[PDB]
Amino acid sequence: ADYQGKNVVIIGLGLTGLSCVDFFLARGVTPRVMDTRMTPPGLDKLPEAVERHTGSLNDEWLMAADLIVASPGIALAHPSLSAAADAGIEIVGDIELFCREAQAPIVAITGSNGKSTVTTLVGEMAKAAGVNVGVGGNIGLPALMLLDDECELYVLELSSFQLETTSSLQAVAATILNVTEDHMDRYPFGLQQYRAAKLRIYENAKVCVVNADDALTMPIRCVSFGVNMGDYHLNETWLRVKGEKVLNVKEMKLSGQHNYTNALAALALADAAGLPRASSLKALTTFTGLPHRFEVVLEHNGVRWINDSKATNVGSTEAALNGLHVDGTLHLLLGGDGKSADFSPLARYLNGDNVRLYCFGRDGAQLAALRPEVAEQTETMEQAMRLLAPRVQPGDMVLLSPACASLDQFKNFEQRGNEFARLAKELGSH
Numbered sequence: 001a002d003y004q005g006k007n008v009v010i011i012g013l014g015l016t017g018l019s020c021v022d023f024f025l026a027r028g029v030t031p032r033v034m035d036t037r038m039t040p041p042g043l044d045k046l047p048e049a050v051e052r053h054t055g056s057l058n059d060e061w062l063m064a065a066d067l068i069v070a071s072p073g074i075a076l077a078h079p080s081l082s083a084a085a086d087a088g089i090e091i092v093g094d095i096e097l098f099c100r101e102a103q104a105p106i107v108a109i110t111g112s113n114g115k116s117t118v119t120t121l122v123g124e125m126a127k128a129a130g131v132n133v134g135v136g137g138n139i140g141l142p143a144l145m146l147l148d149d150e151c152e153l154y155v156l157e158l159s160s161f162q163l164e165t166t167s168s169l170q171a172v173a174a175t176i177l178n179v180t181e182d183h184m185d186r187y188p189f190g191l192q193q194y195r196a197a198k199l200r201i202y203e204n205a206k207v208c209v210v211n212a213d214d215a216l217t218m219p220i221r222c223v224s225f226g227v228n229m230g231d232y233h234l235n236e237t238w239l240r241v242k243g244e245k246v247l248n249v250k251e252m253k254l255s256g257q258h259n260y261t262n263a264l265a266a267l268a269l270a271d272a273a274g275l276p277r278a279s280s281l282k283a284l285t286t287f288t289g290l291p292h293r294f295e296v297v298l299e300h301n302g303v304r305w306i307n308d309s310k311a312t313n314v315g316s317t318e319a320a321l322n323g324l325h326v327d328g329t330l331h332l333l334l335g336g337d338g339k340s341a342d343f344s345p346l347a348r349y350l351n352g353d354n355v356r357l358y359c360f361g362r363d364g365a366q367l368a369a370l371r372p373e374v375a376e377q378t379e380t381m382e383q384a385m386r387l388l389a390p391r392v393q394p395g396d397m398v399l400l401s402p403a404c405a406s407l408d409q410f411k412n413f414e415q416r417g418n419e420f421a422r423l424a425k426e427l428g429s430h
C-alpha cells in the first residue's frame, strides 16, 4: 500500500493515534487528527504541523477524507463514521495498516479472557528459541511501533474492536480463547455481534486454534485445546498433545486450570508457527505472570492481598473465583464501569459465611445488589479498602477483581492496580 497524495484522517490520539501519525509522516504524508475528547493524551507530542480537531468529530474533515484510520475506541456505528462508509470512504484501523506492511508471520490472539497471557507466553516461546520477536497490539506497544525489517515473528493481541476494522490479516496461527459477555455498550446486537467481530481473526488464517470447551470460539479443520478434550488437553496435571505427555505443570510458575488451558493455547499457536517445542516448553517453566493478573502484591500477617485489576469483565472475575481457596474470609472488591454487563453469573460464588463484598464506581449499587446482606457500597476503591482493612483477619484474602472497566475513575486498569497495591501495603502492615 502507498498513501502518497491521500487526505488521511485519524480518529483518536494517545500512543496509538501517535503511532499512526508517525506512520504517515515517515511515509511523506501529513494526516489530520480528531478526538471526541477535549485534551486527549499525546496532544502534546503532536508535531505542530499536523492540524487537530478536538472535543468532537469533524464531519467536514471526515467527508473530505480518502482514508479514515479509526481508533478501536470509536464505534464504526457512530453516525459520523456510518455517513462516511455510506459515502464509500475507506475506514481502517492501525492493525490493518500494520498487516499491509508486515514482512514476517503474525500470530493473532483474541478472547474475553487470557489474551494478554497467551500473547506474552507465545512471545516468550519465540524468545527462548532465539527468534527476533515483536510482541504488542492491544497489549504493550501499539502494533505499528513493532514494524521492523529484522523482525522474524509478530505476536499480536487483538481486541474485538481492532478486528472490526481489520481486513488484511492472514495469520499463520490465530485463536479466539473464549467469548463471554463484554463490551455490550459497543455491541447493540448482543453477544453474537461481539462474537462476530472476534470470528474475523480466522479469515485467511493458516491454522485456527479453537477452545473445544467453548463453542462460540468456533468458526464455520481447526486445531483445538480443552480440559478433557481437544488436540491439546489436560490429563498432578500434565499438558498433553494428542495423547502424549509434554509437561508436568509443577514445572510452571503459573497455576490454576485456566492458566493451564492458556498454556495449551500458546503451545498450539507456537507449534503452528513452527517454533521448536523444547524452547516453547521451556518458556512455560520460566513465565511468572503479568502485573494486575491475579498478582499477589502483599502476603503479610496471615493475609494475602491480590491485585487482579486486569479482571475487567464478568468472565474474568469468574476465573478468579472458580475453585478459589480461602482459609478465612474473602474480602472481594468489585466496581467501576460494567459496560452494561449482566453481573448475576457471579452470584454463584458469593454464598456462605466467609465472603464480604466491597462495591464502588459507576456500577457499585448494581454489584452490591448481588448479595446486599454481605455487601458494602462506596464511591471509590480507596474508601472501600479503608473500610475493609480494619475487618481483615489472619487467614483472610483481600481480592481486587472488579468485573468492570476502570475508565469511570482511573486512567486504565494498571493505575487501578497500582493504587490497590499502594493501599494494601499501607493498610496491610502495622
Ligand SMILES: CCCCOc1ccc2cc(S(=O)(=O)N[C@@H](CCC(=O)O)C(=O)O)ccc2c1
Pocket (backbone or CB within 6 Å): 011, 012, 013, 034, 035, 036, 037, 071, 072, 073, 074, 159, 183, 312, 339, 404, 405, 406, 407, 411, 412, 413, 414
Ligand atoms: C474518539 C476516540 C475515543 C478515545 O477514547 C477511548 C479510547 C480507547 C477506549 C477503549 C475502551 S475499552 O472498551 O477497550 N476499555 C477497556 C478498559 C479497561 C481498563 O479499565 O483499563 C475495557 O473495559 O476492556 C473503552 C473506551 C475507550 C475510549
